[PDB]
Protein backbone atom coordinates (compact mmCIF):
# COMPACT_ATOMS: atom_id res chain seq x y z
CA UNK A 1 0.00 0.00 0.00
CA UNK A 2 1.13 3.57 -0.52
CA UNK A 3 -0.13 6.89 0.80
CA UNK A 4 1.28 9.60 -1.48
CA UNK A 5 2.00 13.23 -0.33
CA UNK A 6 1.93 12.05 3.25
CA UNK A 7 3.17 13.70 6.47
CA UNK A 8 6.99 13.42 6.43
CA UNK A 9 6.97 11.49 9.69
CA UNK A 10 5.05 8.57 8.15
CA UNK A 11 7.21 8.75 5.03
CA UNK A 12 10.55 8.77 6.86
CA UNK A 13 9.57 5.49 8.56
CA UNK A 14 8.85 3.47 5.42
CA UNK A 15 11.98 4.93 3.86
CA UNK A 16 15.72 4.53 4.19
CA UNK A 17 16.83 7.89 2.80
CA UNK A 18 15.15 11.08 4.08
CA UNK A 19 13.48 13.70 1.91
CA UNK A 20 10.85 11.35 0.56
CA UNK A 21 7.08 11.89 0.44
CA UNK A 22 5.37 8.48 0.32
CA UNK A 23 4.32 6.06 3.07
CA UNK A 24 4.61 2.40 2.10
CA UNK A 25 2.87 0.05 4.52
CA UNK A 26 1.22 -3.38 4.53
CA UNK A 27 -2.54 -3.24 3.81
CA UNK A 28 -3.16 -4.97 7.16
CA UNK A 29 -2.50 -1.55 8.70
CA UNK A 30 -2.60 -2.72 12.32
CA UNK A 31 -6.10 -4.18 12.13
CA UNK A 32 -6.90 -6.35 15.14
CA UNK A 33 -4.62 -4.60 17.65
CA UNK A 34 -5.23 -1.97 20.31
CA UNK A 35 -3.49 1.21 21.35
CA UNK A 36 -4.45 2.87 24.64
CA UNK A 37 -3.57 6.57 24.44
CA UNK A 38 -3.05 7.81 28.00
CA UNK A 39 -3.20 11.60 27.58
CA UNK A 40 -5.81 14.37 27.76
CA UNK A 41 -8.24 12.16 25.87
CA UNK A 42 -9.28 11.72 22.25
CA UNK A 43 -11.80 13.62 20.20
CA UNK A 44 -13.38 10.36 19.28
CA UNK A 45 -15.86 11.84 16.87
CA UNK A 46 -13.14 13.23 14.64
CA UNK A 47 -13.81 12.00 11.05
CA UNK A 48 -10.20 10.82 10.73
CA UNK A 49 -10.77 8.16 13.42
CA UNK A 50 -13.57 6.58 11.36
CA UNK A 51 -15.32 5.51 14.53
CA UNK A 52 -12.32 3.47 15.67
CA UNK A 53 -11.32 5.73 18.58
CA UNK A 54 -13.26 5.59 21.85
CA UNK A 55 -13.00 7.10 25.33
CA UNK A 56 -12.73 4.50 28.09
CA UNK A 57 -11.81 6.18 31.43
CA UNK A 58 -11.45 9.72 32.82
CA UNK A 59 -10.18 11.16 36.07
CA UNK A 60 -11.70 14.60 35.62
CA UNK A 61 -15.27 16.03 35.52
CA UNK A 62 -15.57 15.41 31.76
CA UNK A 63 -14.24 12.78 29.31
CA UNK A 64 -13.62 14.76 26.12
CA UNK A 65 -10.41 16.37 24.89
CA UNK A 66 -10.53 20.08 25.53
CA UNK A 67 -6.82 20.60 24.84
CA UNK A 68 -5.93 18.80 21.67
CA UNK A 69 -2.60 17.22 22.66
CA UNK A 70 -4.11 13.79 23.26
CA UNK A 71 -6.10 13.79 20.03
CA UNK A 72 -2.95 14.77 18.15
CA UNK A 73 -1.08 11.76 19.48
CA UNK A 74 -4.06 9.45 18.97
CA UNK A 75 -4.06 10.59 15.38
CA UNK A 76 -0.41 9.80 14.67
CA UNK A 77 -0.91 6.32 16.17
CA UNK A 78 -3.84 5.33 14.03
CA UNK A 79 -5.80 7.83 11.97
CA UNK A 80 -6.70 7.61 8.28
CA UNK A 81 -4.71 10.43 6.76
CA UNK A 82 -1.99 10.74 9.43
CA UNK A 83 -1.56 7.56 11.43
CA UNK A 84 0.94 4.75 11.23
CA UNK A 85 -1.52 1.89 11.93
CA UNK A 86 -4.50 3.15 9.91
CA UNK A 87 -6.87 0.35 10.89
CA UNK A 88 -6.07 -0.07 14.59
CA UNK A 89 -8.33 0.33 17.63
CA UNK A 90 -7.74 3.47 19.75
CA UNK A 91 -8.80 3.66 23.40
CA UNK A 92 -8.80 6.93 25.34
CA UNK A 93 -7.55 7.24 28.92
CA UNK A 94 -7.75 10.82 30.18
CA UNK A 95 -5.11 11.18 32.89
CA UNK A 96 -4.11 14.66 32.01
CA UNK A 97 -6.01 17.87 32.42
CA UNK A 98 -7.23 20.38 29.89
CA UNK A 99 -4.27 22.65 30.64
CA UNK A 100 -1.98 19.73 29.81
CA UNK A 101 -0.97 18.74 33.33
CA UNK A 102 -1.90 16.01 35.80
CA UNK A 103 -0.81 14.58 39.18
CA UNK A 104 1.57 11.63 39.32
CA UNK A 105 -0.83 9.89 41.71
CA UNK A 106 -3.40 9.76 38.93
CA UNK A 107 -0.98 9.15 36.00
CA UNK A 108 -0.21 5.96 37.92
CA UNK A 109 -3.87 5.16 38.39
CA UNK A 110 -4.22 5.46 34.64
CA UNK A 111 -1.49 2.97 33.87
CA UNK A 112 -2.95 0.47 36.35
CA UNK A 113 -6.30 0.76 34.56
CA UNK A 114 -5.04 -0.12 31.09
CA UNK A 115 -3.35 -3.14 32.68
CA UNK A 116 -6.72 -4.71 33.51
CA UNK A 117 -9.09 -2.93 31.08
CA UNK A 118 -7.06 -4.69 28.40
CA UNK A 119 -8.44 -7.95 29.77
CA UNK A 120 -12.09 -7.16 28.87
CA UNK A 121 -11.32 -5.91 25.31
CA UNK A 122 -11.02 -7.87 22.06
CA UNK A 123 -7.52 -7.28 20.64
CA UNK A 124 -6.26 -10.63 19.30
CA UNK A 125 -3.14 -9.08 17.77
CA UNK A 126 -1.78 -7.49 20.94
CA UNK A 127 -2.01 -4.31 22.94
CA UNK A 128 0.15 -1.22 22.78
CA UNK A 129 0.05 1.75 25.16
CA UNK A 130 1.34 5.21 24.27
CA UNK A 131 2.41 7.55 27.07
CA UNK A 132 3.29 11.00 25.63
CA UNK A 133 3.72 12.40 29.15
CA UNK A 134 6.41 12.76 31.69
CA UNK A 135 7.80 14.66 34.57
CA UNK A 136 11.07 14.55 36.52
CA UNK A 137 11.81 11.22 38.41
CA UNK A 138 9.67 9.31 40.77
CA UNK A 139 10.52 5.74 41.55
CA UNK A 140 6.71 5.26 41.75
CA UNK A 141 5.86 6.36 38.20
CA UNK A 142 8.67 4.32 36.61
CA UNK A 143 7.44 1.40 38.67
CA UNK A 144 3.93 1.77 37.24
CA UNK A 145 5.26 1.85 33.69
CA UNK A 146 7.05 -1.41 34.41
CA UNK A 147 3.95 -3.16 35.86
CA UNK A 148 2.03 -2.09 32.80
CA UNK A 149 4.76 -3.66 30.66
CA UNK A 150 4.81 -6.85 32.72
CA UNK A 151 1.11 -7.50 32.12
CA UNK A 152 1.60 -7.82 28.36
CA UNK A 153 1.33 -4.32 26.97
CA UNK A 154 3.93 -2.69 24.75
CA UNK A 155 4.63 0.57 26.63
CA UNK A 156 6.07 3.40 24.56
CA UNK A 157 6.94 6.62 26.40
CA UNK A 158 8.43 10.03 25.57
CA UNK A 159 12.05 10.86 26.43
CA UNK A 160 11.31 14.45 27.40
CA UNK A 161 11.81 17.95 25.96
CA UNK A 162 14.44 19.44 28.33
CA UNK A 163 17.41 18.76 26.02
CA UNK A 164 18.87 16.85 28.94
CA UNK A 165 19.76 13.34 30.01
CA UNK A 166 16.47 11.43 30.25
CA UNK A 167 17.66 9.60 33.38
CA UNK A 168 16.30 12.41 35.55
CA UNK A 169 12.79 12.25 34.05
CA UNK A 170 10.14 9.65 35.07
CA UNK A 171 8.20 7.47 32.49
CA UNK A 172 11.41 7.79 30.40
CA UNK A 173 13.99 6.43 32.83
CA UNK A 174 12.24 3.10 33.32
CA UNK A 175 14.43 0.52 31.54
CA UNK A 176 11.58 -1.97 30.88
CA UNK A 177 9.48 0.33 28.67
CA UNK A 178 10.43 1.87 25.28
CA UNK A 179 11.79 5.41 25.61
CA UNK A 180 11.35 7.39 22.37
CA UNK A 181 13.53 10.35 21.38
CA UNK A 182 12.71 12.91 18.71
CA UNK A 183 14.30 13.47 15.32
CA UNK A 184 13.71 16.18 12.72
CA UNK A 185 13.39 16.13 8.94
CA UNK A 186 17.06 16.49 8.06
CA UNK A 187 17.79 13.40 10.18
CA UNK A 188 18.91 15.66 13.04
CA UNK A 189 18.03 15.13 16.72
CA UNK A 190 15.33 17.67 17.49
CA UNK A 191 16.80 20.59 19.37
CA UNK A 192 14.64 19.72 22.37
CA UNK A 193 14.83 15.94 22.51
CA UNK A 194 16.18 14.30 25.68
CA UNK A 195 19.05 11.89 25.03
CA UNK A 196 20.96 9.49 27.24
CA UNK A 197 21.54 5.76 27.44
CA UNK A 198 18.03 5.09 28.65
CA UNK A 199 16.77 6.08 25.20
CA UNK A 200 15.77 3.13 22.99
CA UNK A 201 14.74 4.46 19.61
CA UNK A 202 14.27 7.74 17.74
CA UNK A 203 11.13 8.75 15.86
CA UNK A 204 9.82 11.75 13.85
CA UNK A 205 8.97 14.59 16.25
CA UNK A 206 9.49 18.03 14.70
CA UNK A 207 6.77 19.76 12.66
CA UNK A 208 4.34 16.85 12.69
CA UNK A 209 0.95 17.33 11.07
CA UNK A 210 -1.91 15.58 12.84
CA UNK A 211 -5.46 15.70 13.96
CA UNK A 212 -6.76 18.23 16.50
CA UNK A 213 -9.93 19.07 18.38
CA UNK A 214 -12.88 20.71 16.67
CA UNK A 215 -12.39 18.30 13.79
CA UNK A 216 -9.23 20.06 12.79
CA UNK A 217 -5.54 19.41 12.38
CA UNK A 218 -2.26 21.23 12.98
CA UNK A 219 1.49 20.88 13.22
CA UNK A 220 3.32 20.75 16.52
CA UNK A 221 6.65 19.38 17.73
CA UNK A 222 8.08 17.29 20.57
CA UNK A 223 8.98 13.83 21.81
CA UNK A 224 5.31 13.74 22.35
CA UNK A 225 4.69 13.35 18.62
CA UNK A 226 7.45 10.80 18.28
CA UNK A 227 6.06 8.36 20.83
CA UNK A 228 2.82 7.53 18.96
CA UNK A 229 4.92 7.02 15.79
CA UNK A 230 6.64 3.93 17.28
CA UNK A 231 3.50 3.00 19.21
CA UNK A 232 1.82 2.86 15.83
CA UNK A 233 4.71 0.88 14.35
CA UNK A 234 4.64 -1.47 17.38
CA UNK A 235 0.98 -2.27 16.79
CA UNK A 236 1.48 -2.44 13.00
CA UNK A 237 4.27 -4.98 13.44
CA UNK A 238 2.40 -6.91 16.10
CA UNK A 239 -0.66 -7.75 13.86
CA UNK A 240 1.79 -8.61 11.18
CA UNK A 241 3.23 -11.42 13.35
CA UNK A 242 6.77 -9.95 13.35
CA UNK A 243 7.03 -9.39 17.12
CA UNK A 244 5.31 -9.81 20.48
CA UNK A 245 4.38 -7.05 22.95
CA UNK A 246 7.00 -8.25 25.39
CA UNK A 247 9.72 -8.15 22.82
CA UNK A 248 8.56 -5.43 20.43
CA UNK A 249 10.82 -2.48 21.35
CA UNK A 250 13.87 -4.75 20.93
CA UNK A 251 12.69 -5.82 17.47
CA UNK A 252 12.05 -2.20 16.49
CA UNK A 253 15.59 -1.22 17.53
CA UNK A 254 17.16 -4.32 15.93
CA UNK A 255 15.45 -3.55 12.64
CA UNK A 256 15.96 0.22 12.75
CA UNK A 257 18.11 2.43 10.56
CA UNK A 258 21.54 2.70 12.14
CA UNK A 259 23.67 5.81 12.32
CA UNK A 260 21.52 7.98 10.05
CA UNK A 261 20.95 10.70 12.69
CA UNK A 262 23.18 13.67 13.50
CA UNK A 263 23.63 15.69 16.70
CA UNK A 264 23.36 12.48 18.75
CA UNK A 265 25.50 12.67 21.93
CA UNK A 266 28.08 9.94 22.49
CA UNK A 267 26.38 7.32 24.63
CA UNK A 268 22.98 7.70 22.95
CA UNK A 269 21.71 5.14 20.42
CA UNK A 270 21.52 6.28 16.82
CA UNK A 271 18.47 4.37 15.61
CA UNK A 272 15.39 5.63 13.74
CA UNK A 273 12.03 3.78 13.78
CA UNK A 274 11.55 1.81 10.54
CA UNK A 275 8.97 -0.73 9.28
CA UNK A 276 11.07 -2.70 6.77
CA UNK A 277 8.32 -2.80 4.11
CA UNK A 278 9.11 -4.19 0.65
CA UNK A 279 6.36 -4.48 -2.02
Amino acid sequence: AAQTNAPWGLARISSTSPGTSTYYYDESAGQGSCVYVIDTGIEASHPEFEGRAQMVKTYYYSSRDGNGHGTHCAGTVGSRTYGVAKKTQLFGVKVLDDNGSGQYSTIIAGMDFVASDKNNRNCPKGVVASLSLGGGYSSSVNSAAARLQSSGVMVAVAAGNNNADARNYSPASEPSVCTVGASDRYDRRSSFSNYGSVLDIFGPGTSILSTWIGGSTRSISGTSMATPHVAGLAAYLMTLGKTTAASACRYIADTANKGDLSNIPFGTVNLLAYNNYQA
Binding site: D39, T40, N67, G68, H69, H72, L96, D97, N99, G100, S101, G102, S132, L133, G134, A158, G160, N161, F192, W212, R218, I220, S221, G222, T223, S224
Partner: peptide, 8 residues
Protein backbone atom coordinates in the same frame (compact mmCIF):
# COMPACT_ATOMS: atom_id res chain seq x y z
CA UNK B 1 1.48 16.14 28.46
CA UNK B 2 4.95 17.00 27.03
CA UNK B 3 4.44 19.67 24.41
CA UNK B 4 3.66 22.53 22.21
CA UNK B 5 0.38 22.86 20.08
CA UNK B 6 -2.16 25.41 21.23
CA UNK B 7 -0.45 23.43 24.22
CA UNK B 8 0.36 20.49 26.48
Amino acid sequence: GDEQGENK
